[PDB]
Symmetry: C2
Subunit: 461 residues, 2 copies
């Protein structure tokens, strides 16, 4: 209890922390339930301790804007430190201060609307591959696991949009390029290892000196040389790798060869499990709400008659599709929390925040607050209609974060998931099965995923 | 050898480092001899590794000025990190960046010429106490250990100038205020513990979590409450403590109660062993060079006839005394090295210095370089005469450092040591004894102290 008397001093309420452990024992229900309860007991501002690390939770929209937008470069610039990361310190997700701002600029033109429009035909090719693999399982007459069929699709999109490798991952399960990427899994920060790290942050320097890395050394070395071969096999003869090689041929230094591999890993970590997991939550909501699925199938057929292929402009034309995606992200924000580290003794919106405190934003908790959402736990896509989309605070609904350090691949993820939804709904309808978890239960761990895999009925139109 | 290929890359020469150990095995001769040899093999710029910590040594005066003066606030602002320090992170010697610049401003008016002139009568009282204790050992007819008789004097000056406690430390060896201060000793950075810290910097966070501190917890707690009692016993009814209490009654926050104790400890650590050790080197040079001692005794009697007491203005009037002090500090710079941490990827005087490299200045080595000093190893006080003092580069002879992070107690130390020299030379002459080490040998460790204690003959005038 070296720093366990900080919130009691400032008059900030919070759960009483145990020595050394802090409030980590309250995570037995998960990040989601611990945040909703604390928002109920203590109100708009409260604090707790991840071991000895003080964590201050804020829920005021004006104060969230100051943290994410206003005082970003000066104060709240970096995220919660974690390790051991090894060479992955050079990744944009982990870099801090000027190293981050240099990396953010070197990768910003990669995610413009112009580059995304050129990636549409490539991504769309695997939409047709997704249908053929789904139609073979549709004539099977048995339930289908969504994250398996969606995992293969997201895999194909990553391998093509990031490295220009075109594989049918579902039909090539033993492909060398597919086998390594499936070894990358989302970090469970409530698992025994990462919890021990949070309780024993002083053990991180020991793991770093032993070359131990939370990123498996095998997968990193595989991509570290696959790039240096493609940097010498493509050279000389539209993917993420090509756009990064063009960047080092111009803040304000060129992108390093090792840094190139770091951001490539971060792109795979981003658009793989997240895309497949979000697409699964959507098809769960479409199957349990057939009225919503039927209405969307009728909107798609209007813009795209005769099952016409979607384009960059026809996707952005669909609004009910955007409503369904936004509503699903509300009930399942894979981020759950948004965190920033306070680097100075500052005072924002009439409250003193000392140096070193991690400022946290319970995104999942604010998405289900009755103070802003009527019938929060219900799947009502009409909240995001142009009629009602104005009654939504842009700092309460933040599925892609906000400010200079938001999700740099937002429009890519949205376009990727919508293209999948469109082609799938142009050929199939989805019915609930017997083993379908109704209502779905979220995992008690540190990841926003269902307890049991989503299984539904797939029929051909 | 994670970072052991940095100097080989930049083309900077240096001794070949062993894995994990680096170049620490070369310290078997001491900081002094390792620096002189490296200045001889590799020239003006070279590098080595304290374990895995790269250390770049520079000897160009224009480049030293850029590090200590020009690019101080922007780049070279902090010193080499070391620990565990505990609460002593709040001390000016250890604080970094804005915490340091806030502390430096809060303590700068404490060391002005006005405050020092008011401390002269208090310090001068223990000059008379020093003579009586020396005259009793003068009629003894036996050799006298200088650091013992000088240690008591420096002790009395600290206890009076910092806390207003007036004790005859030599005649009160069991005084509670004297017993704790003698427990503070200069840190030997070549001892088994601090060497293990340099080789295992990742063990510092473990020692910090165990409340282990290189400053003994007993002495710290003693002064931590002695201040809070004197802050409530003096209150309400010219020392360092009083000047600091007046500062918190005005960058830009008041000085903390805990921070007050931190700087008090740093003052004791500064002006105790250093003052007694430097005063010993001077009396060694005066005894081995009687021509110098006789000339200084004649300069003192001119300004101060009939053994008149010295004042703030009569001390600054003496020039040969200043010459002798400066020349002794040349041959025995207790700093030996001057170090700064490079916080950015900068490039100064046509050389790239990456982030995290400790920039070092071999002060001891430059003080004995024949390229700037004729007959370096000889005690020739005439180098600092107004005739020849102009042929001295202010960035080669830096006994008190240089720049915004120099010794903030320079003029206090000089005035303190000169007052001691004047009163002592007004009543005694110093002859070499049989057990007197001639020539004196420096310690092979990490401290600039003699191998054997200086013993001389003391006679009454
Ligand atoms: C449904 C899909 C996705 C969602 C909901 C999502 C959400 C988020 C959120 C909430 C953040 C943190 C924002 C903040 O800290 O304020 C973030 C960061 C980030 N996202 Fe995503 N993301 C998704 C997919 C992707 C994809 C496909 C990419 C492709 C490159 C990507 C790249 C990144 C990066 C690099 C960051 C870190 C940015 C930085 O630290 O500067 N994300 N994402
Ligand atoms: C013969 C006596 C002394 C010598 C030769 C000496 C020398 C030095 C040197 C070389 C430095 C480092 C300068 C740099 O990094 O560039 C230093 C720092 C310092 N000295 Fe002294 N010193 C002496 C006595 C004292 C005394 C009596 C005090 C009383 C307060 C003192 C207070 C300090 C402090 C606080 C620092 C650190 C300054 C900072 O980090 O901002 N020193 N000293
Ligand atoms: O950017 C990516 C990764 C790519 C991505 C994923 C999803 C969406 N967009 C991008 N994570 C970003 C946050 S850093 C992540 C560690 C990481 C993990 C992988 C790579 C780099 C750093 C973390 O939460 N540390 C917290 C440390 C901690 C917590 C509790 C207790 N003790 C320690 C943004 C993000 C995260 C989660 C969802 C959405 C966005
Ligand atoms: O300011 C004081 C102390 C007071 C003082 C003493 C003498 C003159 N004036 C002031 N030290 C200052 C330097 S920090 C000292 C640690 C310290 C020690 C005590 C308190 C705070 C920090 C250090 O060298 N770390 C290096 C870490 C290291 C080295 C090698 C290998 N691995 C690790 C200035 C100074 C030092 C020496 C002589 C003159 C000035």
């Amino acid at each position: 209890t070296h720093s366990h008397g900080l919130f009691k001093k400032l008059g900030i309420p919070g759960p009483t922390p145990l020595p050394f452990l802090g409030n980590i024992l309250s995570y037995h229900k998960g990040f989601c339930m611990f945040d909703m309860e604390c928002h109920k007991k203590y109100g708009k501002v409260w604090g707790f301790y991840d071991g000895q690390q003080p964590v201050l939770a804020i829920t005021d929209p004006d104060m969230i804007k100051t943290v994410l937008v206003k005082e970003c470069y000066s104060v709240f610039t970096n995220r919660r430190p974690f390790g051991p990361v090894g060479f992955m310190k050079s990744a944009i997700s982990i870099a801090e201060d000027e190293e981050w701002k240099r990396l953010r600029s070197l990768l910003s033109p990669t995610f413009t609307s112009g580059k995304l429009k050129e990636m549409v035909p490539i991504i769309a090719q695997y939409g047709d591959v997704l249908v053929r693999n789904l139609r073979r399982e549709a004539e099977t007459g048995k339930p289908v696991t969504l994250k398996d069929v969606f995992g293969a699709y997201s895999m194909d999109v990553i391998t093509s949009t990031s490295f220009g490798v075109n594989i049918d991952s579902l039909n090539n399960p033993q492909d060398p390029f597919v086998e390594n990427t499936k070894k990358l899994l989302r970090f469970d920060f409530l698992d025994p290892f990462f919890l021990s790290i949070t309780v024993f942050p002083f053990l991180i320097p020991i793991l770093e000196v032993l070359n131990i890395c939370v990123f498996p050394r095998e997968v990193t070395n595989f991509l570290r040389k696959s790039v240096k071969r493609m940097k010498e096999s493509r050279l000389e003869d539209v993917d993420f790798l090509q756009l990064m090689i063009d960047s080092q041929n111009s803040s304000h230094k060129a992108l390093s060869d090792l840094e190139l591999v770091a951001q490539s890993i971060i792109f795979i970590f981003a658009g793989y499990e997240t895309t497949s997991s979000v697409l699964s939550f959507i098809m769960y909501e479409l199957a349990t709400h057939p009225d919503v699925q039927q209405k969307l199938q009728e909107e798609i057929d209007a813009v795209l008659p005769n099952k016409a292929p979607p384009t960059y402009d026809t996707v952005l034309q669909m609004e009910y599709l955007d409503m369904v995606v936004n509503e699903t992200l509300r009930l399942f924000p894979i981020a759950m929390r948004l965190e920033r580290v306070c680097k100075k003794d500052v005072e924002i919106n009439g409250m003193f925040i000392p140096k070193g405190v991690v400022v946290m934003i319970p995104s999942y908790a604010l998405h289900r607050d009755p103070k802003y959402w009527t019938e929060p736990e219900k799947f009502l896509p009409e909240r995001f209609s142009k009629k009602n989309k104005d009654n939504i605070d842009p700092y309460i609904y933040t599925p892609f974060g906000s400010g200079p350090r938001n999700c740099i691949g937002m429009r890519f993820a949205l376009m990727n998931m919508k293209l999948a939804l469109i082609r799938v709904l142009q050929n199939f309808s989805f019915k609930p099965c017997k083993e379908t978890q109704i209502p779905l239960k979220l995992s008690l761990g540190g990841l926003l995923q269902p307890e049991k895999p989503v299984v539904l009925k797939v029929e051909s139109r």
